[PDB]
Amino acid sequence: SSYAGPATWYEGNVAGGTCSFSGYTLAPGIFGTALTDSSWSDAAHCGACISVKGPSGNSIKVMIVDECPGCGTNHLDLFEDAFAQLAATSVGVINVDWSFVPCGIDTPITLKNKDGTSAYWFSMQVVNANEPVASLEVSTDGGSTWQSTTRTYYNYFEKQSGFGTDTVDVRITSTSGATITVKNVSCQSESTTTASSNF
């Protein structure tokens, strides 16, 4: 499904945007964008890639890393360097056509614990996913059962009061239903674990 709407630009914010992608660097040739908060859907589109076609007919690939509270319907706030690929930045705003696409990332997913997590509070972010994330589940029994989490507005998958262990297995489901399971993932505060694959 394709969307038409305005794109403005700002001096973007990967490390401290609404998607909370601290410590992430965008893949080569993928630019950053903010997405209007009218479409935020509790961070459902964080890390999703979009193909954005500008008024000269050329396109770029962007990743949603932030929300735009001042934006209208379908409105993207492109990073400055993204906008510059489509029009001179002095133009300020352009009409674009855009759709969700796979990112074209061939390196693995990484899992990142929020600051302060433990057996008493689970909060984990999926980083570098090639397709949008539908859910993150946690197992304390080696995959005999999978427990649900709730994605926060700021793009952490969380369970208040925790799962009661220092180490869990993690199952990530993409929006197509594909799964990746990462075993023996520490829930230590701020710790990261790299998976063996991507979507």
Side-chain angles (χ1 to χ4, degrees), residues 73-90:
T73 297
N74 292 346
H75 191 149
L76 301 177
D77 211 2
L78 297 174
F79 280 27
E80 183 176 2
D81 59 346
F83 192 102
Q85 296 288 319
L86 299 180
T89 56
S90 57

Side-chain angles (χ1 to χ4, degrees), residues 105-118:
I105 291 166
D106 68 353
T107 50
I109 281 173
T110 292
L111 297 169
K112 181 200 79 184
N113 289 281
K114 205 166 184 281
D115 191 14
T117 58
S118 72

Side-chain angles (χ1 to χ4, degrees), residues 111 113 122 124 137-143 146 165-171 181-188 191-195:
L111 297 169
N113 289 281
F122 183 93
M124 185 174 286
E137 294 156 309
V138 173
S139 177
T140 57
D141 56 22
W146 288 105
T165 66
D166 294 337
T167 299
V168 299
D169 296 347
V170 177
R171 191 171 175 97
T181 298
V182 189
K183 304 193 112 283
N184 305 118
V185 179
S186 177
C187 306
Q188 193 136 259
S191 77
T192 59
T193 297
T194 303

Side-chain angles (χ1 to χ4, degrees), residues 109 126 129 131-137 146 170-182 195-199:
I109 281 173
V126 181
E131 305 216 325
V133 174
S135 66
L136 186 153
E137 294 156 309
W146 288 105
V170 177
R171 191 171 175 97
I172 310 155
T173 305
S174 81
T175 48
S176 78
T179 62
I180 291 170
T181 298
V182 189
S196 60
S197 62
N198 208 330
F199 295 119

Side-chain angles (χ1 to χ4, degrees), residues 87-111:
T89 56
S90 57
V91 174
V93 62
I94 53 175
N95 217 293
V96 298
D97 297 291
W98 62 268
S99 68
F100 290 102
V101 295
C103 294
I105 291 166
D106 68 353
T107 50
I109 281 173
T110 292
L111 297 169

